[PDB]
Symmetry: C2
Subunit: 170 residues, 2 copies
């Protein structure tokens, strides 16, 4: 039978939150639990998925070397790597990468769902092959405050179904 989050190598949980209302306690719990190198998590999502807002909250609203592997383009003096591949970031930091967050919308329509499921396939195909056990995933179900919002478990269930169809369409 089909794709199930349950059968991935890594753990996958789904929690609701709200950037507009700064209700992100579950996401922070998860992040605090996961957090050559200091631990990191990755924030993953398209334009307007809430990432910049999430970073401001995490840096502002809380109470408290160079490796050229796979680099074709890097700036000076900053040493900013351009076209830096997810696969290389993961290979170089290995066990210091502790998890990955997918920012998704709790109020998704059938269209937005498809393009999101394709982004998950892409990124999960890389995390899952990067090491034994993959990298643990949070599906951060934003806009929880909206009258059209669905429970995280139903978003997770709709993503899992549409991911199966994306794999089929191959």
């Amino acid at each position: 039978d089909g794709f199930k989050f349950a059968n991935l190598e890594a753990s996958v949980v789904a929690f609701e939150g709200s950037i507009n209302k700064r209700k992100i306690s579950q996401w922070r719990e998860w992040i605090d639990e996961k957090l050559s190198y200091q631990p990191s998590i990755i924030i993953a999502g398209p334009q307007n998925s809430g990432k910049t807002s999430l970073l401001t909250l995490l840096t502002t609203d809380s109470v408290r070397d160079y490796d050229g592997s796979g680099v074709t383009l890097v700036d000076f003096p900053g040493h900013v790597k351009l076209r830096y591949k997810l696969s290389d970031y993961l290979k170089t930091r290995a066990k210091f990468v502790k998890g990955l967050i997918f920012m998704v919308d709790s109020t998704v329509d059938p269209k937005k769902l498809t393009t999101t499921a394709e982004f998950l396939v892409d990124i999960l195909s890389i995390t899952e092959s990067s090491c034994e056990n993959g990298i643990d995933i949070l599906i951060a179900c934003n806009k929880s405050e909206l009258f059209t919002a669905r429970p995280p478990s139903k978003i997770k269930d709709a993503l899992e179904s549409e991911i199966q169809k994306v794999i089929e369409r191959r």
Copy 2:
């Protein structure tokens, strides 16, 4: 296709990472140089990491799809987005190339230059100024920077002619 017909300036200078004689690169860098930046461009084993060893504000999420925390390191960050975001603070780009070059190695180098140049030149009026850093100039197989530059120009035309 001529480097002279680009909107940006293109210069080629010798240097030796192995011997630490890179004065002409450093001069160009110091002259070209948000804080001012330049970009260093080249495949694995072109000497970028050694070159950085010798040389050594608010977060913006435009075009960002993947970003780490706490570091705010951007992944898959597109050259076009870096350029659009920093604009006039980007002062130059260096192509790391080998002075000793088989005709094999030429085509792959030429394809890389076209890829990058087509993006720098489209980024603004007059594009981004280019240094062709001709490395390993001490070797007995080394050609002078003027010949490396002419070789690349003629190979770029051939690559472009594969339309």
